[PDB]
Coordinates of C-alpha atoms and ligand atoms in Angstrom, one line a residue:
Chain A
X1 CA -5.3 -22.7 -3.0
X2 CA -7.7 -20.4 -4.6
X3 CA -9.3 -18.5 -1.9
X4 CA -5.6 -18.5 -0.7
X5 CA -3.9 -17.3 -3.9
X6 CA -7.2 -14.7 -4.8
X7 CA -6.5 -13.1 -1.3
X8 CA -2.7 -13.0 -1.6
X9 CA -3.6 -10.9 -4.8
X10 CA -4.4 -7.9 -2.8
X11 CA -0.3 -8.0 -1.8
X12 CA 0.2 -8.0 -5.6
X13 CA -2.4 -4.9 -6.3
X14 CA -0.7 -3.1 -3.4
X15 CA 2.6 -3.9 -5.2
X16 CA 1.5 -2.6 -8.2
X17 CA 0.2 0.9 -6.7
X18 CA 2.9 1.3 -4.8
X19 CA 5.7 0.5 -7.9
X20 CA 3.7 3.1 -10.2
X21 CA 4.4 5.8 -7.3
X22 CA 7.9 4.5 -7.4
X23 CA 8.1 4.9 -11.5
X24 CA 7.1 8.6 -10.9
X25 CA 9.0 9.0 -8.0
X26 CA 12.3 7.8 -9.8
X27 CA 11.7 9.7 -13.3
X28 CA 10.6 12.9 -11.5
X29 CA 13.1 12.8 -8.3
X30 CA 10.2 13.7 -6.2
X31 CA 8.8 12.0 -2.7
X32 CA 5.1 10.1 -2.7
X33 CA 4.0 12.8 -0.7
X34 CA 5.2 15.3 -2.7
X35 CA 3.5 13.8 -6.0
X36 CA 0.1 13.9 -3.5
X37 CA 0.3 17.5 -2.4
X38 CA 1.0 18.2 -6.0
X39 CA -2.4 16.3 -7.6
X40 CA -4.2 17.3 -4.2
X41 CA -3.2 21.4 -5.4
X42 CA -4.1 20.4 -8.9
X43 CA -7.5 19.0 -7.8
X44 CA -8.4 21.4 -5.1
X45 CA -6.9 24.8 -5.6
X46 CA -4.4 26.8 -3.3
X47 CA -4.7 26.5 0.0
X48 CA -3.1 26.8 3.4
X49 CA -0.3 24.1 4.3
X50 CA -2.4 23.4 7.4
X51 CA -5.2 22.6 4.8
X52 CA -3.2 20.6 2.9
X53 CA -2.1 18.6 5.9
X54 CA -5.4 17.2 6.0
X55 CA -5.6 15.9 2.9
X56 CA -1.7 14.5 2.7
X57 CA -0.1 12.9 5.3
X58 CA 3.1 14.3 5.9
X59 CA 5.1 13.8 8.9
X60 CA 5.9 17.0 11.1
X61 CA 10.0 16.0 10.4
X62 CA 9.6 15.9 6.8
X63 CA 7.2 18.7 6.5
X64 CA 8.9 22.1 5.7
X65 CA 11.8 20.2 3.8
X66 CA 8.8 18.7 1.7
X67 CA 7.1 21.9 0.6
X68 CA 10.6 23.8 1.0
X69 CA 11.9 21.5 -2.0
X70 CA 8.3 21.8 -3.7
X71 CA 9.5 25.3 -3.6
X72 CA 13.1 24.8 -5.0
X73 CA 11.2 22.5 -7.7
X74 CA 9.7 25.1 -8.8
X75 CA 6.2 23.3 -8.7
X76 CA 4.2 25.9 -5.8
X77 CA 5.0 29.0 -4.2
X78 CA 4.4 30.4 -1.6
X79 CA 2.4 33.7 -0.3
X80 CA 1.5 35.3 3.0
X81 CA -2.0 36.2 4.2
X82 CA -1.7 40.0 4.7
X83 CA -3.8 39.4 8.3
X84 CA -2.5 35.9 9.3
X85 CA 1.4 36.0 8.9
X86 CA 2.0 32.5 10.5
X87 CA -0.5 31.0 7.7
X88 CA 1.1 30.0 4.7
X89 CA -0.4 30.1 1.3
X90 CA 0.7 27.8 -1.5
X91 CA -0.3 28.1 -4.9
X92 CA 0.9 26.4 -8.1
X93 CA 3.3 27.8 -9.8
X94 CA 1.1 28.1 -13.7
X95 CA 5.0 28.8 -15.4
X96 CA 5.0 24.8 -15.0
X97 CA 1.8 24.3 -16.8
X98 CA 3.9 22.5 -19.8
X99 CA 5.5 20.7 -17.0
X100 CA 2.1 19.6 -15.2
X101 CA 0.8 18.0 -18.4
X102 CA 3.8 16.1 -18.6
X103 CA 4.1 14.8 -15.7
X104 CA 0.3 13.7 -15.7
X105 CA 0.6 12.2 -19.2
X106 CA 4.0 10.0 -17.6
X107 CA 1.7 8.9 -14.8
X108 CA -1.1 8.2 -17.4
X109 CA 1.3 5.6 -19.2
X110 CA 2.7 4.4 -16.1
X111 CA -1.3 2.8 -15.5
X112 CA -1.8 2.1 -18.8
X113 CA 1.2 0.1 -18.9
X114 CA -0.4 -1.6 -15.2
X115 CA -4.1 -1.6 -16.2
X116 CA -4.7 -5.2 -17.5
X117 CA -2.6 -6.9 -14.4
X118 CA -4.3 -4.6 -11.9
X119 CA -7.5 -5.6 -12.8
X120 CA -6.4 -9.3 -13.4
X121 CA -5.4 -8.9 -9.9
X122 CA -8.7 -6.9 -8.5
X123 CA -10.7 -10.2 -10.7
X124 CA -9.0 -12.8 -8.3
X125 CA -9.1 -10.7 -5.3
X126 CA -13.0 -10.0 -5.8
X127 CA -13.4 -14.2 -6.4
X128 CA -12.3 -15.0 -2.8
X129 CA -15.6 -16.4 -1.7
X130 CA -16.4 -18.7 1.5
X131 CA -16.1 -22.0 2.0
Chain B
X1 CA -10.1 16.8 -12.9
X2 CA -11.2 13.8 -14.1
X3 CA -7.1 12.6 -14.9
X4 CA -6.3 14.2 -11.5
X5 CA -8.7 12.5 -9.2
X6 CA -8.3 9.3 -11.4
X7 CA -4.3 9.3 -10.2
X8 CA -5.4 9.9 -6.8
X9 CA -7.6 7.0 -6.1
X10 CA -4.2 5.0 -6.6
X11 CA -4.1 6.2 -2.8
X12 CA -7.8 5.3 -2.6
X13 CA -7.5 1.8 -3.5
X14 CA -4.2 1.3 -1.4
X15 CA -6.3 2.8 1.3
X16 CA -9.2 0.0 1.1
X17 CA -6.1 -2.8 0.7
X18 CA -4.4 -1.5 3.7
X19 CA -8.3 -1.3 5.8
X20 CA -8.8 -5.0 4.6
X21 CA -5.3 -5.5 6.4
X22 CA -6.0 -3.4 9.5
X23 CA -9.4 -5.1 10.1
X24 CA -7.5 -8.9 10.3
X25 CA -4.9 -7.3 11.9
X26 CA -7.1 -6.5 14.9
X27 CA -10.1 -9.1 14.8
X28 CA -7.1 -11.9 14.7
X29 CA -4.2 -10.2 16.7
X30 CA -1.6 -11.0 14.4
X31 CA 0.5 -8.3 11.8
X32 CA 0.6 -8.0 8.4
X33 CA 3.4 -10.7 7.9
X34 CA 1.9 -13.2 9.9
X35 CA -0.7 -12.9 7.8
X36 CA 1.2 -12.7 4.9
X37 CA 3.0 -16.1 6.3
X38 CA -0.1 -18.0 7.0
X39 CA -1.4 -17.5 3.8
X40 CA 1.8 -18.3 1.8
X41 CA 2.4 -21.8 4.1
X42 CA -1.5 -22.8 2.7
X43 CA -0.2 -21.6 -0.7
X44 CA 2.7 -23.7 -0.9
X45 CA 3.5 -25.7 2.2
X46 CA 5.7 -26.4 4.8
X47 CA 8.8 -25.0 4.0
X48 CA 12.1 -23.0 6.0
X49 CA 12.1 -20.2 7.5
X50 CA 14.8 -19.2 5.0
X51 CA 12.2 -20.0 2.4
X52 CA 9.6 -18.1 3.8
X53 CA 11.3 -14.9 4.3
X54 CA 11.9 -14.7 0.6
X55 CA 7.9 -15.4 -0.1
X56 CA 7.5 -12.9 3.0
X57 CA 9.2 -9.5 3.7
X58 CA 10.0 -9.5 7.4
X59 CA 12.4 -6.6 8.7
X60 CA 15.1 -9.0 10.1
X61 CA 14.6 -7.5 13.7
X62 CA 11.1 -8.4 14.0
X63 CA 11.3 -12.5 12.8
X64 CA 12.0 -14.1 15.7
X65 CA 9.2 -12.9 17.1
X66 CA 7.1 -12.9 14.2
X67 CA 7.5 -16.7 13.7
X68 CA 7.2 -17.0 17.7
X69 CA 4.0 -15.6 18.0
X70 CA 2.8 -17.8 15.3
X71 CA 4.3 -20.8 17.4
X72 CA 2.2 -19.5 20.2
X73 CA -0.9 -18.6 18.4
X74 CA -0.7 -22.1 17.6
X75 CA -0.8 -21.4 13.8
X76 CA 1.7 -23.6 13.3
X77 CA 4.7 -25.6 14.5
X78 CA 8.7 -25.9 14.0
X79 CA 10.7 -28.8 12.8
X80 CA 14.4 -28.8 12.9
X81 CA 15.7 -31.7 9.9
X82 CA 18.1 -34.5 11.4
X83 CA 20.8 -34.0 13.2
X84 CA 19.9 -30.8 14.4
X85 CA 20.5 -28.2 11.3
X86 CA 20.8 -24.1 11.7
X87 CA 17.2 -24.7 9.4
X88 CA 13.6 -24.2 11.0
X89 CA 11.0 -26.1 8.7
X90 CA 7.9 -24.5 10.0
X91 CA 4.3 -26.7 9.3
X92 CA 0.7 -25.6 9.4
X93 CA -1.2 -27.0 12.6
X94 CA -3.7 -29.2 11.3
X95 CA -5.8 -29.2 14.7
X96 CA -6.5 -25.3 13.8
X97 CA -7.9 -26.3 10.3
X98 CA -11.4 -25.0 11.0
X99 CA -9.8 -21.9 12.1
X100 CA -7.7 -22.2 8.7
X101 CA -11.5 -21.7 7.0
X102 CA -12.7 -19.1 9.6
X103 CA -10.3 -16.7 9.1
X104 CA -10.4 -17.2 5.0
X105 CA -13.7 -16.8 5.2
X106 CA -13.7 -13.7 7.4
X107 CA -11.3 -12.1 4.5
X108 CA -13.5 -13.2 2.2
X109 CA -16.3 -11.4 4.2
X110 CA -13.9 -8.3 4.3
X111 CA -13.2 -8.3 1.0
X112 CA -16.9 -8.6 -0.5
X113 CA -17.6 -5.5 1.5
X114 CA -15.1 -3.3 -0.1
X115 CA -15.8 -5.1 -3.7
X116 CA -18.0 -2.3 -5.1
X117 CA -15.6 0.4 -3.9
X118 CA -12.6 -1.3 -5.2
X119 CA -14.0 -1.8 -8.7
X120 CA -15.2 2.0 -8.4
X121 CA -12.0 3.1 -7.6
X122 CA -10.0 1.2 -9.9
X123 CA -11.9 1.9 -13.0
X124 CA -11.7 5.7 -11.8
X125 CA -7.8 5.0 -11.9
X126 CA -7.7 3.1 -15.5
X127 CA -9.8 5.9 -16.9
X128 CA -6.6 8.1 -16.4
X129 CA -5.4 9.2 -20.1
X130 CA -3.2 11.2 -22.0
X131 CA -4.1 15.0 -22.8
Ligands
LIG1 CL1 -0.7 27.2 7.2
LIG2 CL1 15.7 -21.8 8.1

């Protein structure tokens, strides 16, 4: 059926987002929401890990082992607010610039290499019509 | 950054995909796999259980029930083949074809609303190059 197969599409556009995560998951040993709170740093600036929390949703188990290995990573770093103490600061760490680009230009082929199927697969999704 | 936002609607698009998903979910009381199910049976039909679980993931704890609720929904019904094999052929009810075309057409609906956004979001993603 074609309204039937255009809708199962969005399964197979989910698939695809999901498997470029995993590509940059795999190549750069880090978890999804490590590669957000990374881009989200990148886009936004430092910020507090409260603030970041909104942003990426990280689970209150996995949370200090996730920015604690972000640490270890040597992607961020961390700094106190002088009048806060129980705030945490996190900034990039700019010795990994090299290493940002990198990893950005990875994720750039890792769409490119997507691109045509995910919007063969957004075309049949967007045909569903009624009947 | 234009590359860095670009990569983050991946989680953008997923997001609308996911919305589309939630909004069935709770207009037609059923989960994602059911869903999933219903739309693979109109795809391909009647089939086993067996055969369906490889079209559809469904966490091995939660199929009975899946498939049961189904039953009950009256979605569809279960044959067992002659004598009385270990295999479940499940079939589409046909008295619950107009509700086949309902709900179709309700994705459809929920899809056409999320169209522009999609298409915004994905060409934000496919824009994502190399530097
Ligand atoms: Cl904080
Ligand atoms: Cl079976």
């Amino acid at each position: 059926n074609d309204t039937v197969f255009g809708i199962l599409q969005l399964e197979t556009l989910l698939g695809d987002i999901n498997s470029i995560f995993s590509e940059i998951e795999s190549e750069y040993k880090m978890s999804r929401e490590e590669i957000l709170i990374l881009l989200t740093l990148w886009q936004k600036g430092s910020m507090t890990l409260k603030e970041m929390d909104r942003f990426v949703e990280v689970k209150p188990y996995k949370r200090t082992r996730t920015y604690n290995n972000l640490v270890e990573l040597e992607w961020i770093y961390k700094e106190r607010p002088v009048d806060d103490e129980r705030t945490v600061i996190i900034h990039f760490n700019e010795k990994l610039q090299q290493e940002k680009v990198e990893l950005l230009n990875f994720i750039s082929d890792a769409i490119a290499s997507r691109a045509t199927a995910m919007q063969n697969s957004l075309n049949a999704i967007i045909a569903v019509h009624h009947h």
